[PDB]
Amino acid sequence: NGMLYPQSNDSRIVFPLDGVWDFRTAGEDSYPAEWADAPLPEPLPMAVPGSYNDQNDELNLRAHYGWVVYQRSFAVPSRLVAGQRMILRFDAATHAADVYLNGQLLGSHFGGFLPFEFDVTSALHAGENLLTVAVDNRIGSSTLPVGNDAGTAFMGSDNANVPAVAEAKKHARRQNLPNFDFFNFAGLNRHVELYTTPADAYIADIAITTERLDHIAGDACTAANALIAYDVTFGGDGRQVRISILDGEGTVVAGVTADIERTAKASGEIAIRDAKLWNPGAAYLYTAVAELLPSRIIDAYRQTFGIRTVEVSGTTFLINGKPFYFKGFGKHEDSYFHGRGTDDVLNVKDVSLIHWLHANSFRTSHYPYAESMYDLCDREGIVIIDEVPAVGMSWLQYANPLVAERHREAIRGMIARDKNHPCIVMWSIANEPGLDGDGERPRQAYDYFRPLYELAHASDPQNRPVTLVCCQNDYTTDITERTMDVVCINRYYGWYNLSGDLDAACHALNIELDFWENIGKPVMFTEYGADTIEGIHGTHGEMFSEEFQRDYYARINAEIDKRPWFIGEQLWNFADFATFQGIIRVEGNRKGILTRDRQPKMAAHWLRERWAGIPDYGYK
Amino acid sequence: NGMLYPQSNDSRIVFPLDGVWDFRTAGEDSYPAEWADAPLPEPLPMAVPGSYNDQNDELNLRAHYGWVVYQRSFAVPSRLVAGQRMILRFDAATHAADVYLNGQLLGSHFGGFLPFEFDVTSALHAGENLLTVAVDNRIGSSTLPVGNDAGTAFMGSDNANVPAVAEAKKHARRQNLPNFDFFNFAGLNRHVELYTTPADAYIADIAITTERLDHIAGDACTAANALIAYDVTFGGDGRQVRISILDGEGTVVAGVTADIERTAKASGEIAIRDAKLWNPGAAYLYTAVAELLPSRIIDAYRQTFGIRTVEVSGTTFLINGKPFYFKGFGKHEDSYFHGRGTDDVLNVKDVSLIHWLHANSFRTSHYPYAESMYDLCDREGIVIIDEVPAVGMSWLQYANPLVAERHREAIRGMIARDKNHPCIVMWSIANEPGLDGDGERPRQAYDYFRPLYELAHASDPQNRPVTLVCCQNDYTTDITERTMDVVCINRYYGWYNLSGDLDAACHALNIELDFWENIGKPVMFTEYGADTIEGIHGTHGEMFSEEFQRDYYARINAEIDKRPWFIGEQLWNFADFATFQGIIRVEGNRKGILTRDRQPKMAAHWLRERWAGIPDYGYK
Ligand SMILES: CCCCCC[C@@H]1NC[C@@H](O)[C@H](O)[C@H]1C(=O)O
Ligand SMILES: CCCCCC[C@@H]1NC[C@@H](O)[C@H](O)[C@H]1C(=O)O
């Protein structure tokens, strides 16, 4: 179950496999398996990690459909592999992969945004090892994210009534047809590494939870006592594990020795006096150090955590008992050359921009992000809504068992990976699925999502609130969204409807707000905005102008400020990002308050000024 | 019936009333009648000729709905008006106008793009006269151009299924809802002037036609003989008119004296030996001087004309018996400050750009242009397709008698105004009306348009071909377009459908071309293109990039080059232009091969190179 990030210490070593690999395109539905047996013929270079799509301008890899094959060689000293458990880890391969080592099929994985690993202890040998990775970019009615099996792309234009169009369509080059509004970047998007653990016995998983806070200070910087719980899982094979809690200075402030009982597990509680709490804009991190005992140490893992509680109470969202207000945006892992490839420089910069903006949060739209970003937000005090790639879903998917299982895999996987991060305060199990309509459609959606809501709660030891991000729909026939712990709505009044009429947009908004006022749940924006080309200006700003984007947030935010039960504003988007091409996408999605190069539009400055005056706690 | 452009000579004088007028906005469906009786209170300045919408950044006049009121004073010497017929002419008031002089109602008008005039001989007085003009910008289901009585604008975004949206819309500020893709610029868009004629008898109209050419030279520069016909109409009351034909140097090369017969009218024929012909890229103009005889002259008018024939023969378009090929675009009267206001500096520049591009033609999409532009094209050898404002029409309009009458008014008005221009070779009676579908819809469309086709032929003494510009539709059920003299098609394969896939776009195009091949009419493009933001670049050009626009024309034009019956390529558009705001309009319509400031995008350079190698005559 556990997927702890690979760590180097006195018992463990990590060997990164990132760099410039060999690369070939393959077929729409196959690749030569014999490529795993020998070096790739006439290979291209391809940097790892990164999307492959924008790394070769001679080819049109954005138009590629089907398989590609990665390959490299590597060698490690025999004395290091000696007697160790050897694990090959892929942080992410988008969307599906077959992995070979020295011609042996290790196995396969579906899911483009979560890590997977293989025990390669027996497949390794001395000298050069040959690592071959086939990657499948194809999406469809059974994938998450959801693709279309025929027709158009998300908001795609057609003149189906023309006989000539209908015929040409049947003979067109086959392409991925996304039911989502972000480009299908594929490949080894995140790191690849080989790591070691002890073989006889090793720590397989660690879970830390904040169970109770006693007598929280007025400023919530401290609690008189904090009761935390640990749960350690072991693999391999009156054994014991030592748990030391390190404060921010490395001083051991608490420690217990727990017995391991066999599913080898050790669990218990630890009381910490005058515990320092983790808050938005004021992070504090402890380290839980677990050491497997035989004075010698068998195995060890250092797990960062933060002490904080999260509770939905009525129409309030309480972090350490204080009413929190979300200030932020949905993001994307998107940048010019890397595509969906992880880039720690960009992550560090983006975190600084969030502070510059005086935002305090974002959502991982529309997939779990690279693990390093959460670590970064843990230490920088930025709150996260963590979301699985369940985007583009409709009734066709709810009836599909493969989809249901892939959806369960993602929810359990995301939470298994991310459970220990204090910055994560809420889980999102889908973005804009079909939930409304007539007949049995609302009930069908509910019956699909309710067990996923329950699963997210069951999987998370911290028991954080669970939500589903709702598209702009008929909210009166939608019966699912209102049952979530927090109502998260995507609304584009004045952009996709009532276009350009801000008086009418605000009037319509207030009408839907009157509806939600009665539901009595806490409600927040997870999307709202307007496409905006930097440099377009007007004295009376029209759609696509910098001025209109500014006016838009000013008019909308003035309305939600009148609602005490309205607990957050996360806009769309942090920055312009790449999409499938189309008549409404001007070099991608331009709803960023920043450009793709992270430069601030007029609206960013206005938002920065507004957010500077809004406190993390007690705004409402 | 005649609306000769006002002329100054020894019998006639023109007094221009252009300049900076007084101006007030008024109500959605009324204005204060006393504003005609006295100076406007607290007036704004408003230059005229010009649209009013972009002349005041303190107001949002683009959002204005209903009436505005113009006013100025003027005074002329009594000795000039004495014994003269006094006429006040409005070259254009968009869309409807009520005109007052000195508190007296002169009358009203509805056509927004054609001239109208009043006899003010008796309403004028000595000293300052007060001229008040109320202008109505409203469009709807009975106007040409066509507006929507409710709902949305063109290619407009909606979420009607949301209850909040439905309610807000019913309370929204009233706005014009166009069924066309160009902004509803309104006001005194063209010149205003007072002119004089003799009172007792005067020249009211002149029509010149090329009846026959005998033995045209091999280079079509001359004909051994040209038979031209004249028709002069008189107003007022053995009278005679002298008709002198002047060549380009002012030399009298022919002269006849004709008897006036009573609708007092004189008509006859004149033979011109070794006549110099008017051709695209090689214009030649004569002047017909008509002089009403009492050695004294009663009245006189100089009418410019050019000697050329136009004939559709099979799948060829013959000018002076030679097979012509259209190279060009649809235009707009559109510019940054003037709006739809006429600007002869811009007209002169645009004409030089047409030469720069090596284009030879354009269409007056989607309304008759200012008269000065046709004079310009007469002397510069650019061919024109002249079009009435019948845009946005569908079955709702075909059943409305008021629309039918306004449509007949526009066709007769356009042809009465423009009949003498040699540069005009074809008439267009609509742009993209609804023609297709099932049941009686194709037949209903046919029955509406056939008598308008016949009317256009009956109204034009030169009997030029008549067309109707057809939208991208179901060409198999459309029964109207294939009966026009030239088939003019607007096609957006690869933009609005098969988006971004030029292979599939060309495949679909060729399928429709296979259809038109058998119809046996000459066929041309009147629209095709792709929105393009200057400065957006890619190695593999996607939609909105300069490269994609270039690739688009390159792939499409290669296909039509294979069809001998395809006699012209007029793209969309000459230059970026203003539209109603919406999610597919990035600061207006960006399908220009030039920017709104008339700067060339990449495609313009490519098109210039292609057109440089295509001759006006004999390409096919
Ligand atoms: C109003 C109904 C349509 C709203 C759709 C808004 C879309 N939501 C999900 C995001 O991934 C898209 O980028 C966003 C958009 O298109 O910018
Ligand atoms: C593909 C079927 C619809 C095509 C419509 C294309 C439109 N025709 C008339 C022009 O006035 C518009 O500007 C043009 C467009 O939108 O650029």
Numbering used by the authors:
A (entry chain D), B (entry chain A): -1 to 235, 274 to 298, 303 to 334, 342 to 667
The study reports:
However, intestinal bacterial GUSs cleave the attached glucuronic acid for use as a carbon source, allowing potentially toxic compounds to re-enter the enterohepatic circulation. However, microflora-encoding β-glucuronidases (GUSs) are notorious for reversing the glucuronidation to release SN-38 in the intestinal lumen and thus represent the major cause of undesirable effects. GUS contains a deep enzyme active site (the two catalytic glutamates lie ~12 Å below the protein surface). To understand the underlying structural basis, we prepared C6-propyl, -hexyl, and -nonyl UIFGs (2–4, respectively) and resolved the eight X-ray crystal structures of 1–4 bound to EcGUS or Bifidobacterium dentium GUS (BdGUS).
Because the resolutions of the four structures for BdGUS (1.7–2.4 Å) were higher than those for EcGUS (2.5–3.2 Å), water molecules could be visualized in the catalytic site. Water molecules I–III were conserved in all of the BdGUS structures and located near the UIFG-binding moiety to mediate interactions between the inhibitor and certain residues. Interestingly, waters V–VII were absent in the inhibitors 3- and 4-bound forms. The alkyl substituents of 2–4 appear to expel some of the water molecules. f Superimposition of inhibitors 1–4 in the crystal structures. However, LgGUS and BdGUS have more spacious aglycone-binding sites than EcGUS and CpGUS, explaining why 2–4 did not have high affinity for LgGUS and BdGUS. To develop inhibitors with higher affinity for LgGUS and BdGUS, a bulkier group should be considered, e.g., phenyl group.
